[PDB]
Structure 1
Amino acid sequence: ICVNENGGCEQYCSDHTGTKRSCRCHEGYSLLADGVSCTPTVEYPCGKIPILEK
């Protein structure tokens, strides 16, 4: 459930009546196989300091 711990999602969380919640990512990111983590799909994704990582 998204209401608690953000559904364990790294970024966005969507609730569903039947099955479990699904996680999503902000524009410029994409969901990995674990279904919760988001990886950049652009060189300069929003909200990340390049320097600290390069």
Structure 2
Amino acid sequence: LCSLDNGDCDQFCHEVVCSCARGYTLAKACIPTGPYPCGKQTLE
């Protein structure tokens, strides 16, 4: 169930089937595809 540890998903969870925001690919975990993926603070 997504109700326990978010189904182990790094981002989205539905019924387990994980999802990621646009700009990420499913590795559970979600992997950024660029230097400025959504929702990430930026470093110099």
TM-score range, shorter chain: 0.7 to 0.9
Larger Rg: 1
Structure 2 residue runs of 5 or longer lacking an equivalent are none
Say which structure is richer in helix: 1
Question: Could you tell me which of 12, 37, 43 is aligned with 1:45?
Answer: 37
How many pairs does the alignment contain?
A: 44
Q: CA deviation at 1:6?
A: 0.6
Matched with 1:18 is: none
What letter corresponds to residue 24 of structure 1 in structure 2? S
Structure 1 residue runs of 5 or longer lacking an equivalent are 16-20
Say which structure is richer in strand: 2
Q: CA deviation at 1:50?
A: 2.0
Normalised by the length of structure 1, the TM-score is 0.70
**Structure 1 runs (4+) greater than 3 angstroms displaced:** none
